[PDB]
Symmetry: none
Subunit: 270 residues, 2 copies
């Protein structure tokens, strides 16, 4: 038996433990995954506890994807590049950090048949997810990329090609894709969108990294205008599988993602 889990501040909504349970079941693996809610004042204690108790791996979510890096022994090059970690592996009392965010986005975009080549996109928010999305969009030949934040202050982006804007300036931007990388639209207030209907009207494709069985207001507003929408579930399943590949150091059959995603997509709702 090996133990794994998800580290974040508030996790009562998370579907990750269910996804990982399903992956272990399909692969006939003796392992278990639970939530590890940890307060901001306690995050410096995580690395010692993982090591002490032999927790083989953890995922990391908001708001710790950047702050956890200083506690790791080795950081994989893709995570260094992106500037955040969402997957940690314990081996020989050392912690290795990885980031499956770029991978999951690539996966989600291919599945949804969305080519970002020569397009205009806006990313909402500035966390680790936003950094991965920025990295993915730039590598994929995005023509114009904006990242929207509530207050610019002295924020700096990873690539000078990306344009930092606030939500006021966003009112006058028209583009192809708008991607939500903010924590807005999950478990508590599912009826609130990070952007108004007027801004949503200026885009053709909405991508929401959030997943909630009840559907986010962001995508609910997009669907009402006949816009192309995509939720975060496929990415969540792909990232779980990639994490599992890293933790076991073995590759998982390609067909498993679709099997798990389709079976889960029903369990929450028809």
């Amino acid at each position: 038996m090996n133990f794994f889990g998800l580290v974040g501040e508030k996790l009562s909504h998370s579907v990750s433990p269910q996804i990982h349970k399903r992956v272990f079941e399909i692969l006939n693996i003796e392992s278990a995954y639970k939530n590890f809610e940890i307060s901001k004042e306690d995050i410096s204690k995580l690395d010692g506890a993982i090591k002490l108790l032999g927790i083989q791996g953890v995922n990391v979510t908001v708001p710790y994807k950047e702050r956890i890096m200083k506690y790791l022994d080795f950081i994989s090059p893709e995570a260094k590049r992106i500037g955040a970690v969402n997957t940690i592996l314990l081996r020989e009392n050392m912690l290795y950090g990885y980031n499956t965010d770029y991978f999951g986005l690539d996966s989600m975009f291919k599945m949804a048949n969305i080519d970002v080549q020569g397009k205009v996109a806006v990313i909402l928010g500035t966390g680790g997810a936003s950094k991965a999305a920025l990295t993915y969009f730039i590598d994929s030949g995005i023509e114009k990329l904006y990242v929207s934040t509530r207050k610019k202050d002295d924020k700096k982006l990873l690539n000078s090609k990306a344009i930092l804007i606030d939500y006021e300036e966003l009112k006058h931007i028209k583009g192809d894709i708008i991607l939500n990388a903010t924590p807005v639209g999950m478990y508590p207030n599912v009826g609130i969108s990070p952007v108004s209907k007027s801004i949503i009207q200026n885009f053709d494709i909405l991508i929401d990294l959030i997943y909630n069985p009840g559907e986010t207001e962001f995508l609910r507003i997009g669907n009402s205008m006949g816009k192309k929408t995509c939720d975060g579930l496929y990415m969540l399943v792909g990232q779980a599988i990639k994490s599992q590949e890293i933790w076991q150091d073995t590759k998982i059959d390609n067909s498993i993602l679709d099997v798990i995603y389709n079976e889960l997509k029903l369990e929450f709702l028809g």
Copy 2:
């Protein structure tokens, strides 16, 4: 089209190119693999050249498995533990180091039905392979493990003189003695070989090594390095292609080569 290859000092005896070619054929992949012979004074230039030319992956063999680690951007947990790299991946201008020796050994021992739990074993040599074998023996519950070197975890270090008095179950050759340079020479004498029940040689040259020839002349169980060499190749391809490869391909390729170099 993507390019791959094998980095080592002397590679005339390599069958790795044939193995990889066959993997690409079976999987319908547009890629190619060749030998990259590199001198000791030039090995510091490899990382730059791989990056510059976009070489997606290389294997590394003797005598560079340890020395190359210092030039890479990331060392995987198993490469760090074993202490050697035999597989390098290029991704976004960064080099990642992996070790498939351990995996290949584990695969080989299971195929040959050699169980090491509670047994006595001697490893000849102190390189990266010795390290992979040492790691594998220890993890697999070996009772007593010796590592022999002419110039001298819980492994007991011994010289070839002390080896003369050691009786054991398994003797494994992790030295480069037996390949191309001098293919008619064994790292240990017939007198030492008689003291073990099973010989494992990591070296593979279509023509049986002198080490195993001597073992077979005495009715000892012998196992050459071919299965491990095929297994490592497929594990390297999984890493490079970032995709699962059906295990049936290992038996296909091994049996083609075994049947090729036997009859």
